[PDB]
A paper describes a structure:
A salt bridge between Arg202 (Arg218) on the self-inhibitory loop and Asp177 (Asp189) locks the S1 pocket and rigidifies the exosite.
Here, ensemble refinement (ER) of FD and thrombin crystal structures is used to evaluate structure and dynamics simultaneously. Using ER, we detected a highly flexible state of an FD variant [[name] (R218A)]. ER modelled a large number of alternative conformations for the exosite loops, with root-mean-square (r.m.s.) differences in amino-acid positions of up to 6 Å. Different crystal-packing environments of the two copies in the asymmetric unit showed different amounts of disorder of the exosite loops, as indicated by large displacements of the exosite loops 1, 3 and 4 in the first copy and of loop 4 in the other copy. We initially observed an unfolding of the N-terminus that did not account for the observed electron density; therefore, for subsequent runs of this data set a weak harmonic restraint was placed on the Cα atom of the terminal Ile. The ensemble repeats show high real-space correlation values between ensemble repeats, the majority of which are greater than 0.95, with a minimum of 0.60 around the exosite loops showing high flexibility, demonstrating the reproducibility of the ER method. The dual role of Arg202 (Arg218) in FD self-inhibition and substrate recognition suggests that the conformational dynamics of the FD [name] (R218A) mutant ensemble may represent a highly flexible intermediate state between the disruption of the Arg202–Asp177 (Arg218–Asp189) self-inhibitory lock and interaction with binding partners.
Author numbering: 1 to 228
């Protein structure tokens, strides 16, 4: 963190921790009983494995009755994802079994209609912090409300300089100091999944630095198809 606050425990029952070898790698979002959406860059690299997903968690380290760790039957990165690009940066993970659903675990509706989130809309992003930003990292789930930034301005020569295609969206990042982006994590507007974090901003510095998110509606055809 240097954006935000501790979330209410289990009030985002869609939130997932994508894990490598039992350590938090990336955020993700439960989009169907057996399927979690995250970002391709997360699981990018090569060797392995023991990629799993933790559902029903608030703390990454402490006992909680709802916590369940799922192995993954299949990792499906968007075919057009590339290591050297923030395009098509989505990742679907098929869980070993249907998630057991309840107050702490519950898929989130996601936007199928390909329309942009209106600029100014307040959306919610949640996650758990990187490298080991404090060994247990941030240990409990954090979130913050960010206003959506118009694509035009996001594309300014000082913001993101034409990088933001119509398949991407932006949020004002955060003034005062810097940064965040769990990655793979979700951007939720009015209770609907609209975006997934991409390395926006992993080049942090300005005042009006914006976060970059992949628009899930733009990939609705690919998502649904992997699900069927």
């Amino acid at each position: 963190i240097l954006g935000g606050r501790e979330a209410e425990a289990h009030a985002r029952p869609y939130m997932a921790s994508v894990q490598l070898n039992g350590a938090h790698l990336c955020g993700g979002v439960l989009v169907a009983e057996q399927w979690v959406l995250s970002a391709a860059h997360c699981l990018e690299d090569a060797a392995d494995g023991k990629v799993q997903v933790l559902l029903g968690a608030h703390s990454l380290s402490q006992p909680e009755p709802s916590k369940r760790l799922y192995d993954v039957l299949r990792a499906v990165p968007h075919p057009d994802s590339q290591p050297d690009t923030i395009d098509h940066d989505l990742l679907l993970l098929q869980l070993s079994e249907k998630a057991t659903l309840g107050p702490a675990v519950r898929p989130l509706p996601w936007q199928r209609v390909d329309r942009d989130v209106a600029p100014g809309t307040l959306c919610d992003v949640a996650g758990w912090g990187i490298v080991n930003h404090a060994g247990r990292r941030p240990d409990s789930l954090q979130h913050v409300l960010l206003p959506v930034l118009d694509r035009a301005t996001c594309n300014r020569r000082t913001h993101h300089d034409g990088a933001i295609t119509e398949r991407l969206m932006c949020a004002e990042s955060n003034r005062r100091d810097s940064c965040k982006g769990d990655s793979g994590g979700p951007l939720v507007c009015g209770g609907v999944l609209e975006g997934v974090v991409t390395s926006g901003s992993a080049v942090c510095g300005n005042r009006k630095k914006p976060g970059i998110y992949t628009r899930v509606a733009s990939y609705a055809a690919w998502i649904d198809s992997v699900l069927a």
